Paper text:
GH29 α-l-fucosidases catalyze the hydrolysis of terminal α-l-fucosidic linkages. GH29 α-l-fucosidases process their substrate with overall retention of configuration at the anomeric center of the cleaved fucopyranose and do so through a double-displacement mechanism. In this mechanism, first proposed by Koshland,, SN2 displacement of the aglycon (activated through protonation by the general acid/base residue) by nucleophilic attack of the catalytic nucleophile yields a fucosyl-enzyme intermediate, which is subsequently hydrolyzed to yield α-l-fucopyranose together with the released aglycon. Crystallographic analysis on bacterial α-l-fucosidase confirms that the ABPs act by covalent modification of the active site nucleophile.
In order to minimize steric clashes, BtFuc2970 was subsequently incubated with 5. Upon trans-diaxial opening of the acylaziridine the covalently bound and substituted cyclohexane adopts a slightly distorted 3H4 conformation (between 3H4 and 3S1); consistent with the expected catalytic itinerary. Whereas aziridines and epoxides that are annulated to cyclohexane rings preferably open in a trans-diaxial fashion through a chair-like transition state, reaction with the α-l-fucosidase nucleophile takes place at the aziridine carbon corresponding to the anomeric center of a substrate α-l-fucoside. This corresponds to ring opening to yield a skew boat, as is observed in the trapped enzyme active site in the co-crystal.
Numbering used by the authors: 35 to 473
């Protein structure tokens, strides 16, 4: 047991109403919108295949020249009400918004820098408009914040001198000022999701990460804070040097979700996966033919997978410079919304069921102990294997959409064959189980 001043604060999962709401939401959208949407992955005639929001880095553009894109920031088609309607129709219960990305351009009129929406042709407080519009649709708003900031020369990647330590301290004050500004301007914020926190400078200032968490929690009652923010006394990130999760939930799994057999440890804490539609484009990229683009069923699979293991899932959008969404993203949102409207009782406010994974798909557990089978891979056997934990029996199976009764056959102790429906549903579908636990 290593003594730590700046390690974990929560003992197990938070169970206050704000955390329960964060968890029960389950399905979110991400918005990555900033100056990078203007070039859209192209600089000086070269299209770069790397993530579009990192174009400043790929094309080696100096800060002064990158930030002159503010002169072209004029999203004529932007309408916060339309963005919120799109999220509602998709079935998303919360939206995470890039307040400021690594480029340092702020989507709110910060009083602490000139690189903000106020100093563009458009002028308006985009962040504020979105907060209002989403909240008006009953959608929670979370703030993405990049600590790393390419626009501020006080940022340091590492601390190799007293001068660096002084400059970086000033940088951390500036960061605190922006954070407090966001928390006091937009008090309905429910979460702060940090990125750009991997550098040695931040790792050497674990105290600051703990302070930022505490500062925001005093300003915004019940706010959630992601693990990615946090480094302990030894520089260890996400989980402290004693293996304990820092912040309120684990933020990770952008590349690959937790394995449903080998990574059951994640059911012990709150967690959230965030996902791109292409392989690795968060901001707007003009050419989606450069990498694999996920289909709606592939995204739906990921969403259910997350919930089945006790986690949230957030689907990313990278709006066009004009303030509208590309057609592929409108199609995705509509497709997800259709399926969610039919089958969402197996997603919203659901959790890990504690059953052994089977090949046909995933289990999820509802708040009244409903066990939902979400079937993605239809067996030629016409039988869905259900192995129950000790003391649990399956009493009935019902097709969620129609209420039709589904045959259940016991094959051996604690194992059943659940029949597939009489008519193939032709899409991923749900069977709801009634289970009983012995005394
Ligand atoms: C951080 C940023 O570097 C990326 O551009 C993007 O904002 C994603 C969401 C985030 N990625 C990770 C691994 O933290």
């Amino acid at each position: 047991e290593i003594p730590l001043k700046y390690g974990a604060t929560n003992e197990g999962k938070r169970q206050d109403p704000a955390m329960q709401k964060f968890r029960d939401n389950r399905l979110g959208a991400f918005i990555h919108w900033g100056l990078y949407a203007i070039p859209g992955g192209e600089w000086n005639g070269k299209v770069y295949g790397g993530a579009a929001e990192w174009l400043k880095s790929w094309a080696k553009v100096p800060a002064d020249e990158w930030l002159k894109l503010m002169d072209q920031w004029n999203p004529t088609k932007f309408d916060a009400k339309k963005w919120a309607k799109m999220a509602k129709e998709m079935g998303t219960k919360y939206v995470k918004i890039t307040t400021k990305h690594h480029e340092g351009f702020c989507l709110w009129p910060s009083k602490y820098t000139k690189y903000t929406v106020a100093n563009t042709p458009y002028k308006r407080d985009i962040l504020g408009e979105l907060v209002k519009a989403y909240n008006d649709e009953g959608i929670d708003v979370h703030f993405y914040f990049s600590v790393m900031d390419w626009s501020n020369p006080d940022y340091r990647y590492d601390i190799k001198s007293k001068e660096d330590s002084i400059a970086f301290s000033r940088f951390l004050e500036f960061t605190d000022n922006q954070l407090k500004e966001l928390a006091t301007r937009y008090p309905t914020v429910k979460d702060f999701w940090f990125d750009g926190t991997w550098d040695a400078s931040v790792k050497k200032n674990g105290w600051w990460t703990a302070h930022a968490e505490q500062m925001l929690k005093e300003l915004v009652p019940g706010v959630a804070i992601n693990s990615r923010l946090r480094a302990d006394d030894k520089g260890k990130r996400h989980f402290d040097s004693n293996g304990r999760l820092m912040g309120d939930y684990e933020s990770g799994y952008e590349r690959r979700l937790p394995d449903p057999v080998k990574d059951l440890k994640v059911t012990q804490w709150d967690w959230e996966a965030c996902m791109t539609i292409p392989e690795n484009q968060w901001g707007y990229h003009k050419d989606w033919s450069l990498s694999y683009v996920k289909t709606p069923i592939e995204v739906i699979d990921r969403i259910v997978h997350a919930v089945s293991m006790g986690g949230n899932m957030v689907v990313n959008f990278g709006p066009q410079a004009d303030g509208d969404f590309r057609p592929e993203e409108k199609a995705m949102a509509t497709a997800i919304g259709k399926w969610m409207n039919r089958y969402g009782k197996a997603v919203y406010a659901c959790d890990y069921a504690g059953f052994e994974k089977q090949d046909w798909g995933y289990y999820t557990r509802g708040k009244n102990d409903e066990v939902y089978m979400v079937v993605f891979n239809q067996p030629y056997s016409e039988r869905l294997i259900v192995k129950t934990p000790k003391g649990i029996t399956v009493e009935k199976a019902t097709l969620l959409t129609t209420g039709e009764d589904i045959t259940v056959v016991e094959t051996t102790r604690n194992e059943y064959n659940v029949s597939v429906p009489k008519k193939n549903p032709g899409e991923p579908y749900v069977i709801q189980l009634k289970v009983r636990a012995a005394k």
